[PDB]
Design the sequence.
């Protein structure tokens, strides 16, 4: 059971690691879209 | 190995806090279910089968044939589910002998 | 040291959990800004 | 039992195959040794043999029992992981094998 607990935690960690990478990539895109939209308003 | 004889299907990344939750899962040919098996909703990082947030007994499949693949569904009620508490949870299938035989990807209630 | 390994993994998971929650939080706010900016610009 | 060395200013990301400086602090709760080592470990490691690389944690000069001394180690990019998507952490492992420090995770990217 101690082994199952460690396995289940690695499995959860691996999924949250992937989701962090997806989140950070979206973060970069949304920030570029904002810079583009703010830049449109200054002209 | 033994930890993936039950497969939780189409688990979402998050569920609405305290909303009714259907939990779908599959018994592979490697497990013979038992009426005292159960599915718990565990905070990620749990140490024992005792650390569950809520649970439901797993209904013994009718007309069960050994070595078959069987689909199961459990309706967790919102009033026994986490609120938006910042934690991540997962489903775990626990046999009547105490073994964890499947554990889902994690989800947050928000 | 199986419990040290579990401990180290718990704390590593908790850090990545917090990073994911913050990144998704910011992402939802970034989306509110994009709508707010676009409302000034297109339709 | 596991927080007796603290890694300071440990970041989220270090450049791959690049010169890295590793800052950590010896607290008066455990005692340094010349053959104590700082290992870099993939998150999820099971035993101390799962290290990626390490370096000997040098002994500070005129070491006074029960002090607080900060240390710096310079791993070089030849020994460090690539941009592999994995999370690693710092672990201080002593000469008799116990780990008394595990940093927050970082990537190499």
Sequence:
């Amino acid at each position: 059971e101690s082994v199952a607990s460690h396995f289940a935690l690695v499995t959860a960690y691996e999924d949250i690691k992937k989701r962090l990478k997806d989140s950070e990539k979206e973060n970069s895109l949304l920030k570029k879209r904002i810079r583009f939209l703010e830049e449109k308003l200054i002209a | 190995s033994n930890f993936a004889h039950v497969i939780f299907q189409n688990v979402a990344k998050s569920y609405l806090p305290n909303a009714h939750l259907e939990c779908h899962y599959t018994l592979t040919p490697y497990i013979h279910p038992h009426p005292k098996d159960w599915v718990g909703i565990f905070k990620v990082g749990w140490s024992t089968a005792r650390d569950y947030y809520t649970f439901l007994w797993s209904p013994m499949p009718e007309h069960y044939v050994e070595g078959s693949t069987v689909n199961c569904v459990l309706a967790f009620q919102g009033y026994y589910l986490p609120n938006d508490d910042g934690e991540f949870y997962q489903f775990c299938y626990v046999t009547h002998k105490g073994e964890i035989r499947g554990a889902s990807t994690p989800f947050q209630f928000r």
In short: The longest strand of chain B covers residues 21-27. Residues 38 and 57 of chain B are 4 Å apart (CA to CA). The two ends of chain B are 32 Å apart (CA to CA). Chain B has one domain: 1-110.
